[PDB]
Write a sequence for this structure.
C-alpha cells in the first residue's frame, strides 16, 4: 500500500488492459510506485498512453523501446538516465507480440541480457529485474539460464534477477482452463492481478534476499508434474 | 506496513531472539499481524513469553504446543478455536530443537502433516501454512513431498502451503559463511529479517496465487549448483 513508495519502475509489455504487464503496472501503482512505460510500435503507443492516463498520481513517462532494437533500447535507458536518473527495477514482461505468444517467448529469451545491460546503468541503488514466462521449451531453457547468469553477475551491484511463471489466464484453450480449474491445487485459473501482486513482492525490499528465483503463479498446478498431459 | 492488518498467525519455533522464527514474528508484527506463540517445554516457555512481551500492540497469546505430542498439539488448536476462533496462517518454523539443527529438521518433517490437520480447523477463511528448512537430505525429501501433498489437499479450502529454504545465518562454520559471502550472487549471508520479510509476503493476500512453492532465501547461492562443494 506504500511498499514501493519513492521507487520507480520500467514496465515493458503493455499491449492492452488484459496484458499481464498491465496487471503488474496496476499492482505496482497501488503499492505507491512511479512508473515508466515502454511501447514497441505505433499501434501499442496509443494503447499504452491511454492506459497510463487512467492511473491517478505521479506522472508516467511513456517511451519507445523495441527490445529487439539495440539502438532504441539503449536510447530508451539513456532518456531514463537523463530525466529521472535512478530507477529501482524493470518488469521485462512481454507475453504477447505482434503465434504471438510464442513470438513473445522467443523475443523475451534473446532480449533479456541486453535489457539488463542497460538497466544496470540506471539502477545505482540496486533493485530487481523481473522477467515473465506465460504458460498459456527451448526459449524457456534459455530464459532460465539467462536469469541465473544475470542474478550471479548483477547481485554484487545489489540487483536481484527473478522470474514469474504465470499459468493460463482466461482473458488471454477452454479444455486447458477446465483442467486447471478442476485439478490445480487452488481449483481456479490465474489472474493478471495475482501475477502483479507477486511482482510487488519481488520489486519490494521484502524480497531483498531473493534472487535467481522462478516463482510459479499458477494456482499450484506446477506441483502435479502433468507437463505432458 | 499494514499488509497483514486484521490477520492472526501462529508462530512455532521461537527459542531466543536469534531464532529464525523470531525474525518471522517481528516481520509479521511490523506488518500489522496479531500473533499467537507456541513453546515446547518449560525452558522455552519463559524465553517466548519475554520476547512476546517486547512487542508493542495487540496482545500475544503464548500457548504450549509440543508438535511431537498429538494430544497437546490438538489441545493447542482447540484453545485457539475457543479464544480467537479463526486464524489466517501458521508458521511451522522450528529450526533448532533441544545435533539440534538436524533434530529440528526431523521433527519438522514428521510433524507438518498433523500441524496442518489441526490448523485447517481454524483457518475457515483460508490463508497460508509456512514451513522452514534451514540449510545452515532424507528429511528434506520428506518435507518437500509433504508440502506438495498438503498444497494439493488444502487448496480447495483456500489454504496455501509453502516453504522457505533459508541459507546459513551467522548468528546461528566460518568456512561455510565465507564461501557464501565470496561466492553467493548477493555476496552476503542470510538474515532472520530477510526470511521474515519473505514470510510476510507468503502470509499476505499478495501471495494468494502462490502455493506448493519453495522460496530460497539464501542470497542466491542455490543457483550455483554447489551442493557437494
Amino acid at each position: 500500500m506504500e511498499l514501493l513508495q519513492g521507487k520507480t519502475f520500467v514496465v515493458m509489455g503493455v499491449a492492452n488492459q488484459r496484458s499481464i504487464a498491465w496487471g503488474i503496472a496496476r499492482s505496482l501503482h497501488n503499492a505507491g510506485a512511479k512508473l515508466i512505460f515502454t511501447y514497441a510500435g505505433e499501434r501499442l503507443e496509443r494503447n499504452v498512453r491511454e492506459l497510463a492516463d487512467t492511473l491517478e498520481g505521479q506522472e508516467s513517462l511513456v517511451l519507445p523501446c523495441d527490445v529487439t532494437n539495440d539502438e532504441e533500447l539503449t536510447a530508451c535507458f539513456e532518456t531514463i538516465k537523463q530525466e529521472v536518473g535512478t530507477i529501482h527495477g524493470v518488469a521485462h514482461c512481454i507475453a504477447f507480440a505482434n503465434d504471438g505468444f510464442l513470438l513473445a517467448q522467443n523475443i523475451s529469451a534473446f532480449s533479456l541480457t541486453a535489457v539488463a545491460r542497460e538497466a544496470k546503468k540506471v539502477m545505482t541503488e540496486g533493485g530487481n529485474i523481473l522477467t515473465l514466462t506465460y504458460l498459456g521449451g527451448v526459449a524457456k531453457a534459455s530464459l532460465e539460464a539467462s536469469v541465473k547468469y544475470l542474478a550471479n553477475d548483477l547481485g554484487q551491484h545489489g540487483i536481484r534477477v527473478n522470474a514469474i511463471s504465470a499459468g493460463p489466464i482466461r482473458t488471454l484453450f477452454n479444455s486447458i482452463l477446465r483442467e486447471i480449474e478442476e485439478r490445480a491445487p487452488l481449483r481456479r485459473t490465474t489472474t493478471q492481478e495475482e501475477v502483479g501482486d507477486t511482482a510487488v513482492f519481488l520489486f519490494s525490499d521484502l524480497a531483498r534476499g531473493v534472487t535467481g528465483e522462478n516463482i510459479h503463479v499458477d494456482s499450484g498446478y506446477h506441483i502435479l508434474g502433468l507437463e505432458h498431459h
Summary: DSSP finds seven helices and seven strands in chain B. Residues 1-229 of chain B form a domain with the Rossmann fold fold (CATH 3.40.50.720). The longest strand of chain B covers residues 127-134.
